[PDB]
Symmetry: C4
Subunit: 206 residues, 4 copies
């Protein structure tokens, strides 16, 4: 839990997301719980030009260290850590399939047993609100209360876990589930799902 | 047939599957027939962190060597080698297209002459059962009796052959067939197929 | 603003577009505003065989330096710089998703808040005209008057910005928007959109 | 035109096709016109294990040099060079999109002006016949009479040009056209096309 060791992982995660096809462009942001606040990527700086010195610290009051501009979405990373006290890392990206399902404004159902990875029998979709807005924060906070990941209507995906690699794994897993959903939904509607009872069993085995 | 030479190939195969886009995440497992039992990847350890020392040996009774946890699916690798005595390697993954067709719970038909590569005129889809369950084993064993590969409903794909590279080749081939199926089925239903007589001829030439 | 420093970026951009999957083959062309005219890639020379010496200079009259053949599309790069005086770089490619939407002859609507990146609430589609034609130039010039990017019916995409990297970023962003559009339109028609009022707000925050 | 310089390009082409996503597995074959016959890849040997020594020479009578097994499709490479005397290289692959359109048994229409690259206003689809069959040869020969590329029903794609790189470029271009076709056809049927008159003009400019 050294600011320097955290900064390095944060950039790695951004690089890994681009590497996995879960994000590209100036989209996305990542943070880790640090001290009273968190360490978060800065607004609009390409993952390729990022360095530990660019990572920003925001305290419990929302005070970011001077001369640095935190991610426009810092408020919903805030709400994420408050909604999920068990979570130490938040990952946000505009992954293609997760984003398309969010344009459709649909929760992703129990089409695969791995859905249980997000903590339940669905991946919810949170109502739209202007990006970097406080109202957007209320929407995600509410969605993450009982799920580890949530889609953002007309926006993207946000997943959080105990650490960055488990947070990245989860976000990656949701891109797979979102892709399985879009592919089968184009051929059939509704797409077959496992029953809630079955999901209960799978959650027991997890 | 040296434990060490086998361990190395097993990890390579996992790396190659990720490399080919046939698997990603903590999904998938691979094993080779070894002595009375088999050598199989361990449960939940990233392909990147895998080493020959992590590969687990399970004997004919299902006894895995102490201090090591075999893949949760070890039972259906077992059933695979019992159902197909001609097979020396099993590959399991959650490849995107194979998995979507399995959510649709459909066999993949004779849409391409390469379907004959799995031993017949179809790639079956085995009924769902909780992962790592003995009932799941009964389902795959039954499906592999007359086919070298089978989809797992709401789960993924399992392919086996005489060795790991032929097992990987086959699994890869089925991802192609599953992708040709999903793409044409979105435009037309039913998708045109070669006749069984034609498949018979192709099987003769193989 | 040295001819040599510009030539290098132009080739890089072509390489980066192939690298991002926004273009492949002998398709595409890129130019930068230079002196009274511009520096533009040459017609039909693989990005791999390109060198600073191949980059062509065309003056304000359309006079390209002797012994060099400029891109067949040089006329619409011309029209682009005249239509958008704020723009210093033009990028053209036959990116898969942008091109499919252009075959459908549709503008891309407000399906995502990033649509505002092109300057409005849509990505227009300019009427077809034979490639490398002066009439094609009139069509793009007209489309770029109030937008930074435009699709070309039955052809591809053209995006321009203040410099090559912002021009490449934008073109990349439009491939994402075009892909979100094609994926959701196959499942639903019309695809849900953000209201113009909302887009207005997002444009204010940009 | 040295056997050794040709062998090297042939393998490169196979490697490049896998690299571009136009082929994978043990599928595909490539040949160049050599002396009275041709040099062609051998049947069933992974592109990774190929060497100049594996390339096979078949004479005008179909006599392949001893101890070497030519590609099962050597007969249709033969027919290709006889149908198109202007062609010096043939490329065959089971590229995903070209193959799906061939399962649908459709010609690819004038959806993009680049269709003119294959010599006309369409990419035909040749009737199925067992692979490596003489009747399959009659089908491709007939299709290539007035086109440089043809799809093979329930099989794949075959493209030929004056040399391997122009043959690879063309095959790659057809994968793009086949992908634009499948994507728009899922949303609309029939997919809008340029008129034959327009294609005539484009063919004039080519
Ligand atoms: Zn965002
Ligand atoms: Zn599994
Ligand atoms: Zn163009
Ligand atoms: Zn073939």
């Amino acid at each position: 839990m050294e600011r320097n060791k955290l900064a390095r992982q944060i950039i790695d995660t951004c690089l890994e997301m681009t590497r996995l096809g879960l994000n590209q462009g100036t989209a996305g942001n990542v943070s880790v719980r640090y001290q009273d606040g968190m360490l978060i990527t800065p607004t609009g700086i390409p993952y390729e030009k990022l360095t530990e010195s660019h990572i920003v610290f925001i305290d419990g009051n929302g005070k970011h260290e001077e001369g640095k501009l935190p991610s426009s979405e810092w408020r919903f990373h805030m709400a994420a850590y408050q909604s999920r006290p068990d979570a130490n890392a938040v990952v946000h990206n505009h992954a293609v399939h997760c984003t398309a399902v969010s344009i459709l404004n649909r929760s992703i159902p129990a089409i695969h047993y791995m859905i249980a990875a997000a903590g339940g029998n669905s991946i919810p979709c949170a109502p739209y609100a202007t990006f970097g807005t406080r109202e957007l924060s209320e929407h995600v906070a509410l969605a993450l209360k009982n799920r580890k990941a949530t889609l953002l209507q007309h926006h993207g995906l946000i997943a959080c876990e105990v650490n960055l690699e488990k947070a990245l794994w989860l976000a990656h897993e949701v891109e797979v589930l979102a892709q399985l959903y879009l592919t089968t939904l184009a051929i059939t509607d509704p797409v077959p799902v496992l029953s809630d009872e079955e999901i209960a069993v799978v959650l027991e085995k997890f």
